[PDB]
Every structure is written in C-alpha cells, then in structure tokens.
Amino acid sequence: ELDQLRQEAEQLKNQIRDARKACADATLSQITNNIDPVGRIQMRTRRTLRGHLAKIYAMHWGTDSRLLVSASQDGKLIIWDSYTTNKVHAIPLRSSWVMTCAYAPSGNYVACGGLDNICSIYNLKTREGNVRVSRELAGHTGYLSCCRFLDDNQIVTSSGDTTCALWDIETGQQTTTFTGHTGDVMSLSLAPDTRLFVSGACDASAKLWDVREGMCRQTFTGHESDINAICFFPNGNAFATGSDDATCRLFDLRADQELMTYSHDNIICGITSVSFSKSGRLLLAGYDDFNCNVWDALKADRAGVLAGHDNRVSCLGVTDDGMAVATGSWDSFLKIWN
Amino acid sequence: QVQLQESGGGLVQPGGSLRLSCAASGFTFSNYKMNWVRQAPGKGLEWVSDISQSGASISYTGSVKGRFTISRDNAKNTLYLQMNSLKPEDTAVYYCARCPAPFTRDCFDVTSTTYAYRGQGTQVTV
Amino acid sequence: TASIAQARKLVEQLKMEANIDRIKVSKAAADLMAYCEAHAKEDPLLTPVPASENPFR
Amino acid sequence: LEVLIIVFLTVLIISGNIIVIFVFHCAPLLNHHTTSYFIQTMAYADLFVGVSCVVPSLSLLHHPLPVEESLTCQIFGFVVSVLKSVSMASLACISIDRYIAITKPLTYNTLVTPWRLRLCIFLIWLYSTLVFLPSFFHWGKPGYHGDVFQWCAESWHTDSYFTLFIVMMLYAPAALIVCFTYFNIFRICQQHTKDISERQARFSRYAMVLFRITSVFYILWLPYIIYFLLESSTGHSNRFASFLTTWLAISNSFCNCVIYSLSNSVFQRGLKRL
Amino acid sequence: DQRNEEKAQREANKKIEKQLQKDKQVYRATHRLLLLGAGESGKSTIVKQMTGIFETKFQVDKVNFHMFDVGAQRDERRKWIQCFNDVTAIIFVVASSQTNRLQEALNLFKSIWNNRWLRTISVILFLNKQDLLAEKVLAKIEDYFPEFARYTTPEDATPEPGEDPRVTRAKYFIRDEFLRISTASGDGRHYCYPHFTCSVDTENIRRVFNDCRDIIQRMHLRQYELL
C-alpha cells in the first residue's frame, strides 16, 4: 500500500522536476549582464523611536506612510508618528509573549498575537476615548507567527500548528483553513490584488494559496533550512524568501522555479526579515549579526549596509510610497532610514 | 530539496553485525551535525548517536556504547553506522536525522514525531 | 495504517500541481527587468530625493 | 613648566569630558542603569573644571582680566573648589550605588528610585556649594588653587579651624565611604570566584579592576589633604609642593573620565559603532 | 489648526510617557522564571506548592516572582524557546527513573545549555522523585549508564540520616551527570544549581529564592566588569 504510493509520489516529483528543467531557457543573471549597476547606496538614520522597555518583535507601516505600530516583550503595543516622533497610543496586552502585529489598511484597527495562540483585534477609533479589545479569535492550537488584514472584517493568520486560516472577525469563526505544511509556519505575504498569498514554513518550503478556493496552487522548495521571511515583488509575479542557512532567494510564479540567490561566503547568520523597494530593484534583508544588507535584486550584488543596532534585527518594513525604511531590533529601538 | 535516504538492514542472527548507510542530498553535508535515531515497536523515537561537522566529537547512548560506531564522509556525502554484536532488544527502525541549522552545536527536535529533516528508516530485526 | 491518507493526499496534491502551464525563464526575466526599468524613476530609495521634499530630513 | 602643565591638563579635561557627554547622549541607551546618573554628573563637573581652568590659562599668557587680580583669584578658588568637591562626592555616590546593587540584589530597584537619584544629585550640589561658603565671610582661605596668581599666593592666610571644617565635612567621609564599600565588594567577588573555580576544577581579574579604582583616587587626593592639614595647622609652607599636589588633584578630573568611561566595554562598542 | 494640534500631540505624548515610567518602575522589580520538565517529572505538584501558556504569581519576603509553564503547544521547541532568552532562570525538573527517560532529560539539558540565545541563563535543577529512587535502588543503572560500576560517592557528600549509601551513590551519580554536562561549556557565563527535592516539600520556594539571589548578585558583579 504505502510502497506504491511512495513510488507514485517519487514519479510525480521526478515528472515535475523534469517539467521545470525543460523550462530553464536562460539564467536571470545571463540576461541582466548589460544592465548598468546601481552603485553604492548610502542611507542615514533620520529618526529614532525610544519608548520600549524590552525586545521588539514586530512592526507594520500604515498605508498613509506616516504612522506605524510596534510590539515588544514588556507587554506593550505602541503607535508612533514617524514624522514628529510622538507616541499616539500605547496599548497594554494581557500576555507578555507576542510574536506579531499588523496594522489595518483602513487605519481603524490593529492586531497582535503570540504564544497564547490567540489573535486580538484592537479598535483604534475610540468613540469614548480609550482603546479596547474588539475581538479575541481563538481557534489555533499553536502560537501565532504572522497576521495580515485583508479588510476591516477579514484577516489571515499563520500558526505553529502547521496551519493558516481566514477569519470573519464579526462572527469570530474560521471561514477557511489552509492545511499543507509539515512544520511551523513563520510568515505570510498578501498579494497586491489580495487574491493569493504565500507562506514560509519550518520545512524549507513555500506554498501559494487561493484565498477563495482554499487550496494550495504551487510549492517552491529551494531553501536548505527553516524559512523566516517572505515578501512579494511589487509586480505580484515573484517573491523573495529568507531562511536560517544565511541566504535569500527569488522565486517566480509563472516559471514555477527559482531565479536568483543572494548569499556570500562571509555571511553565516540567518535572515529574520526581507522587504523590497518601491520599484523592486532593491531587496533589504535583516540578519542575526546585528545589521541589515541592501541587495541589487537584478544582479545579486550588495549595494550597502544599515549598521545602527546593538542587538539582532528582528523586523523590517518599507513605506507604501517607498520613502523610508524602518528597522526594529532586540535593543528596544526603532530607526527610520532614508 | 532536502532528502535523506537510508539503506541497509534486514534480518540478522543475534550476535551478528550490520552496517547502515544514509545518502544526503539537497544541502551541504559539511555544515551540519548528523544523528541516528531509532524507534522500537509500540514505543517512541529514541536517540542513538551523533557526529560533529568535522567528525571529531562523537556521542552514544549508554546501552549501545562500545558496539555501535558512527562515521561520516564529507566528500562522498554519506553517513554510516556499524552495528556489531547485536542483541534482540536492538530491533527497531533506524533513521538519519539532521540538525535544523548549520554551524550550531545544539540540535533540538531530531527525536520528534513529525520532523522535517530525516529519512524514512530501515527495519533491523534480530 | 493511519498513514494511508497522508500518502493519498500527497499523491493528489502532486498530481494537481503537475498539470500547470510554465513560462520560459527568459520571458520572466525580461518582464522583471522591464518592470524595474519602467518604474525606476519613481523610487525615492534608489535615486535619492533632494531634501526640499524629503519629509524626514 | 606651569603654563605647559596647565594648558595640557585643561585641553585633556575638556576634550575627554566632551567626548564622554556626546557618546552618552547621541547613541543608543547609554542612559539605562542608575550609576550612569552619577557618572554623567561627575562628567559635567569635570567639564566645568576644564572650562574654569581657562582663566589661569589666559592670565598666564599675559592676558590679565579686565577685573582686578584679587577678584579673579577670589572667584577662581571658590569655583574650582566647589566643582572638585562635586566630583569627589559623585565618585563616592557611585561606590555607594554599586555596594547597594551588589549587597541587596533582589530589592535594589525598590531601594534606588529615580526620585531618590534626583534628590541625591541636588543635595550633592547644595552641600558642596554650602561647605565653602564661609570663605567669602572672614573665616579663612579655602584652598591653594589660587596660589598661581601672585596676589593670593601671599594675601590670604589659611585658618586651622576652617581647614579642619572643610576636611571633616567633605574629604574624610568621601574616603571612608570608598574604602568600606569597595572592601566589601572585594570580599564578595573573592567568594564567588572561589565557588566558580572549585566547580570547574571538579570535573575536568577582579583584583586589578578594584585596584585601579581604589588607588588612583588615593594617590591623587591624599597628597593634597595631607599638605592642607600640615600647612594649615603648623604654618610650615612649601611652594614647591603645593603646585604639585593641587594640580595632581585637578588631573584626577581626567583620570575619573578614563577609568570610569573609557575602560567599559559597552562604551567602546557604542563609540565604535558611531 | 497647526499649533493647537501640535500641542495636543505633545500632551498625549507626555501622558503616555508618564504611564510608561510607572510601568517601567513596576517591570524591573519582578523576576521571571520558566518552568520546564517532562510530564512524568512531577511539575504539577511543584506548581501546586506555589491556552498556550500558563502563569503563576508568588512573592517571598516581599519580592515578586513570575513562573511560566508551557501549555498547549507542539513538541518542536526550536522556535518558541527563543522567547525566553532573558528570564532570570530556568527550572528544570527531572524524575529519577518505557524507554530511557534520563537520556532524553540529559539531551534536553544539553540542547538548552548550548543554544545560542540561552547562553546566559542559569538553570535551577530539581531531581524530584527521591523516594521512588530510594525504593528502586534497594530492590540496574549499570545497564543503561555503564559508568555506574566505577562510580564512588564524593567525599563532600551530605547523606540524609538513616539512608544507606546504596541510594546516595545513585543520587550523586545522576547529579554529576547533569553537572558534568553543565561544565563542558559555558565560558563561566552561567551556572547550575542542583537540588534533591521530593514529591512533598515545604521549602522549594526558599531554594528558588536563594538561587535567584545568587544569580542576580553574580550578574551585577559581572556587569561592572568585576568578574
């Protein structure tokens, strides 16, 4: 029974591998050789946000490119004003162990989650003046790794029980469940059109899901160790990942394989976060060796370094107008670069 | 893609010998500490031995220390185990498990029910 | 023998994933490069912006 | 001699305290723990000592002040003595803070709160300014810092009782405190190191850190306090030794900078990253 | 429209910062611990002496303590174990003993000790079931740990009255297994405190209090570059 099933799985794997092999016409580096290099990129710290008592685990930029939320170990959730460095809100959490936070695309809400297996949604439009828990979504059987709003009533979570889900915040139930991975899921990224999303798990693989169908579309399995970060290309046709083997990679949805690899022999630390530029020419990655690296996405050449943190870099994001980069770290500081 | 494939095993007489092999693909064999784990019938998985990146540090379980040996070939990308002077209680399925991350000295989850970086196992019976 | 369902699911997933259409890597690389070169002028991080309209300086 | 020593010391003092202040302020935390408050206060006092060492620097390069010489020495002695006493008081409070952190490690944060730190700093400045106040009244000469000027070197005459008052109220307490606290910390380090060694040796630095803290202070401050008492009580003056003792005590305002900020590893990391 | 809203921003910032300074005052006066150990070890009775994660509050001599026990998670520790990298101490509970359980306990200790983010945490080790060990020995360790036959009780052993050395040898053998794993590495940056507890005991909180006091004293000595 299991013998012929394993044989047929191996046969299908070989058929898929040969199908991809018959498609590698020419390497991406072979095509972008004549393109003039970007040149050195210098970025300076413009702001420094100083209010967290302990490590910082996550952050998210508002769609207005001005405000941002951040989470920390002390049990706080602080909303900043990056232009003027003024704290707007500071929400105290019931559980001190939070691993993620998201900021709604409309600006009316903010989410968080962590080791308590629960996603809490906070209503910022305080009719009476105070911020209070709108909804507590409890259906997972493992910690929460990431969460991203679709709109004011839908949110996608990824968990440490090898499962992602889609929620109806009004009812508090699970609309759909995405069950393909065989390890903890550590990140997710929503498409520009928000009809698909990709996840990264602790089995060195990534998958492409259909939010409305509820099924896996494609699987990308280049990496060697656990995947920690994931992000789409601005086009929506490619994405980049970052894993524990001190490497980043670029995958394409239409060719169904890998295109580029961003690594060096002197880099032996894992990547904690990736992000793209507004045009998709830069690729920013934060490492465990206390600093960030800027990559030329088309030629795989380093273009700069963002070294301003004393402990490891845990999160990284780029505004929606592409004007600034915010970097959080375990030394309890955020820094805006430009 | 990470793939570990065990070979060797079968039925041997008590007091006999065996030699397992595990061929690794999809990663650099030279950056990872390698393990061997086993699962007796109706029981959970149990750690057996391991060998370092270079091949210097080696450890064994108390009950197999003195008989079993673990060795690796970084050039040929293979992991070995020599199981001589067996006892009936040594019947189990043996897996080669790799530590999750490179350049590390700890290995957490090798002896776990659903681990992503080990093979399918070879039945060894006495 | 509770692992029969696991292998069944793996087989259906791989079988459904093998019947998709694929585009030659030359076309994908050309599209990526074209997008980057068509939106290169609207990247404040790539071509640094003068401090007059920089909101953080 | 005197011009070179004074100018070199002034430049070193100002430069070191400026770099310390700016590394504290323009970097990551460097403002995190409690002892940093007294370290910063001592840095400010040392920097003002360096600035106030410009009046004799200018006056010795034949640039007499618009005001008289008597006024300049009158003001200079008061200002420099007050700032030196502030530095020594902050140096004693650093040791008290460390003693509390090491002896009471579980209730340390309850005992030492930021309100108490602010009150302590304010009381340090008040006490230091109020001890030397009777110099304006006709009690005596506060110190020998103004003896470079050729008026004060012969015009003021120290008083035995004012000198004894200054000693007993500022100097002796600040030496007894340092001795007691660092001796007890020495005993605690000595027992912990023994425990660690006996653990590690079963199955298979503190001296020279305390020796730098508790010997620079004494080698720079005890010569001054000894000559002060002898010359005040007896009258056996010696111009050859007063300059040396006084300007050693002044150089302590840069020795404090080096052995309290530069040797720390976190400070070096913050300075190398900036 | 501009200056008044700037004033509102500054007022909100000031109020937030005042609440944050009060919170920081509360946060530094509490010591957080992580309680580990397998199910058969006997963590439940230890907790009763004092959902993805649990929590217990207790104070000794007016010093507040938190203790966190992992609830409904999976058996893959390599990811959620990094959240606990700056707790005061870890409490590792072991039962003196169906496969080889002591080997899994020792392997988990070795993994915790050498982890990159847990190289500054000290472990308070409880060897729990000292009565089951008393009966089992006097009724085998050589067949799972073959070094036992060459083990002799340390000279500085403290035997309980009315106890035959037959159990004292096994007690000190297991303790020395954990302790010899402990000293193989660590650069002297963290320490292990092993205790022989029982199923029922009235002084586990006192032992944890003394061990945490020693841990914090050594940490303070080390942050002034005195150690």
Residue numbers in the entry:
A (entry chain B): 3 to 340
B (entry chain N): 1 to 126
C (entry chain G): 6 to 62
D (entry chain A): 30 to 233, 249 to 318
E (entry chain C): 11 to 60, 205 to 251, 262 to 303, 307 to 394
Quote the study's own text.
GPR21 belongs to class A orphan GPCR and is a novel treatment target for type 2 diabetes, primarily caused by systemic insulin resistance. The endogenous ligands for human GPR21 remain unidentified. In the HEK293T cells, GPR21 is an active receptor that negatively controls insulin responsiveness. To gain further insights into the structural mechanisms of GPR21 activation, we employed cryo‐electron microscopy (cryo‐EM) and single‐particle analysis to resolve the high‐resolution structure of GPR21‐Gαs complexes.
To obtain the pure GPR21‐G protein complexes, wild‐type GPR21 with BRIL‐fusion was expressed in Spodoptera frugiperda (Sf9) insect cells. The GPR21‐Gs‐Nb35 structure obtained by cryo‐EM analysis has a nominal global resolution of 2.91 Å. Gαs‐coupled GPR21 showed prominent outward displacement of transmembrane helix 6 (TM6), the hallmark feature of class A GPCRs. The data suggested that the GPR21 structure represented an active state GPCR. Similar to the active GPR52, GPR21 exhibited a rotameric switch on R3.50, which opened the ionic lock to facilitate Gαs‐coupling. Polar interactions between TM5/7 and α5 helix of Gαs stabilized the GPR21‐Gαs complex and helped to maintain the active conformation. GPR21 ECL2 exhibited highly stable conformation and was inserted deeply into the orthosteric ligand‐binding pocket of GPR21. The immersed region was constrained in position via an intra‐loop salt bridge (K170ECL2 and D176ECL2). Unlike other class A GPCRs, which might require agonist binding to induce a compact structure at the extracellular milieu, the cap region of GPR21 ECL2 was closed and anchored at the cognate ligand pocket with high stability. Replacing ECL2 (cap region or immersed region) with a flexible GS linker significantly abrogated the downstream cAMP accumulation mediated by Gαs protein.
